[PDB]
Amino acid sequence: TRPKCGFCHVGEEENEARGKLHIFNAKKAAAHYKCMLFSSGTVQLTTTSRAEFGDFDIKTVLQEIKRGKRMKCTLCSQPGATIGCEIKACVKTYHYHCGVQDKAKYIENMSRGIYKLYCKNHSG
Ligand SMILES: [Zn+2]
Ligand SMILES: [Zn+2]
Ligand SMILES: [Zn+2]
C-alpha cells in the first residue's frame, strides 16, 4: 500500500540514510533523495541539498526508474541499480546504499551541481 523507492525498493523507513522518499504520481512512482540524486540519468535543474531540495527534471527520474528494471546491482544483484561508475566503459552500477558498502566514492559539488560515483577500481 505505502510507497517504496523505485530504485532500492524500500519506503520511508530508510529516509535518514538514503534521503527523504519523494512521490511523483498517483501510481506511487517514488524515490529517496540520494537514490535519485546520484542516478546517472537524473537531470538536476537548480542547486540542491538535504536542507533545501532542488529542482530536478522528474521525467528523467521516471525514465531512470524504468531503466533500473534492467540494471542488476554490482553488489546485491537486484534491479534498480542506476548509479553507474562515472568512467564511461566501467560496468559497475549500484543502489545508493550498496555503493557505500562496496567502497565506492561519492563526489558532491553543490555549487557546480556535480553528483557522481566512482567505483573501487576507479577511486584513484
Ligand atoms: Zn531508494
Ligand atoms: Zn544493490
Ligand atoms: Zn568504475
Among 59, 56, 78, 60, smallest CA distance to 69 is for: 78
CB 120 within 8 A of CB 103: yes
Q: Report the structure determination method.
A: X-ray
* Deposited resolution, Å: 1.5
CA of 105 to the centre of ligand 3 (A): 10
CA of 88 to the centre of ligand 3 (A): 8
After which residues is the backbone of the chain broken at C–N > 2.5 Å? none
Measured CA to CA, the distance from residue 10 to residue 45 in angstroms comes to 26
Instruction: Starting from the CA of residue 102, give the closest ligand.
Output: 2
Measured CA to CA, the distance from residue 95 to residue 50 in angstroms comes to 19
CB 96 within 8 A of CB 109: no
Among 53, 71, 91, smallest CA distance to 8 is for: 71
CA of 111 to the centre of ligand 1 (A): 24
As given in the structure block, the three cell numbers for residue 112 are 557546480
CA of 88 to the centre of ligand 1 (A): 24
Instruction: Starting from the CA of residue 34, give the closest ligand.
Output: 1
- Which residue bears the cell 511523483? 24
As given in the structure block, the three cell numbers for residue 45 are 535543474
Residue range 1-124 in CATH 3.30.40.10: yes
Instruction: Starting from the CA of residue 71, give the closest ligand.
Output: 2
Measured CA to CA, the distance from residue 122 to residue 7 in angstroms comes to 23
Instruction: Starting from the CA of residue 80, give the closest ligand.
Output: 2
In a 10 Å sphere around its CB, with 0-12 CB exposed, 13-18 middle and 19+ buried, how is residue 16 labelled? exposed
Helix extents (H) in 7-80: 15-18, 33-38, 58-68
CA 114 to chain centre: 13
* Partners of residue 93 on adjacent β-strands: 84
CA of 5 to the centre of ligand 1 (A): 5
